[PDB]
């Protein structure tokens, strides 16, 4: 359950990220595939090398889905319906992998927004991502 301060914090961070969102999504993916190699098996047909156009493309998709969730942060189950069916029912992603990607997204924000990434903002972003993760893993 996201407080009004969390919402305010998450929205502010999205703010500072600006149009770098796609790029940051990409970098988080790269961080995930390298730090947690098991995750790569979900992406057999991807070239996962640095600068991959496929990783770049996908990170933009992920950032766009997160932005959509923030934009409708009080109705995430609905907004993210098609995406939770994809991930759970079709792709059978292990729920654990969501904490892995979440942490990489946090690492990526921290690496780029030293001012915005306070302990409070960190706390809110973490809850946000865990909220998104809950939705995306609800349809097994």
């Amino acid at each position: 359950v996201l407080s009004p301060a969390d919402k305010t914090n998450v929205k502010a961070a999205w703010g500072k990220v600006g149009a770098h969102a796609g790029e940051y999504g990409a970098e988080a993916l790269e961080r995930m595939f390298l730090s947690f190699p098991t995750t790569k098996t979900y992406f057999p047909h991807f070239d996962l090398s640095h600068g991959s156009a496929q990783v770049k493309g996908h990170g933009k998709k992920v950032a766009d889905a997160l932005t959509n969730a923030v934009a409708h942060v009080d109705d995430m189950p609905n907004a993210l319906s098609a995406l939770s069916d994809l991930h759970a029912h079709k792709l059978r992603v292990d729920p654990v992998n969501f904490k892995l990607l979440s942490h990489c997204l946090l690492v990526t924000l921290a690496a780029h927004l030293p001012a915005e990434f306070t302990p409070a903002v960190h706390a809110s972003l973490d809850k946000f991502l865990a909220s998104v993760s809950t939705v995306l893993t609800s349809k097994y």
């Binding site: 730090s35 946090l106 690492v107 921290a110 690496a111 302990p119 960190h122």
Partner: protein
Amino acid sequence: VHLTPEEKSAVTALWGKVNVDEVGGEALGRLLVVYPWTQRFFESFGDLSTPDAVMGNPKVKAHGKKVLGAFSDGLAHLDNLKGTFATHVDPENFRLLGNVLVCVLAHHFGKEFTPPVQAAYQKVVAGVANALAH
């Protein structure tokens, strides 16, 4: 942990430049803020009423240097982590602390905390967490 030499290189180069007086208290402090149940693990430390109150609490800072210390120990002993941490809660909270630390490193080093460098730290924090959970 089996760290490849480039991996060891990535860790040691960044680690030498860490403010050992502050990074540990940040990580531990962010842990208490991000994961509030962890506060109970620390009964003595007194006031933990807010984020600002947590981050500015002497015992936090004090114990943070020890976390860092323990991290250094593990780094120069990755051959045998069990018998370096012979001395603590669900293994998961050690993992959480390891990841908060990684976020703090990312925070302090920015661009320098590249994806490969992160990957190498995750192996260390994982090794330490598991060793400490033994």
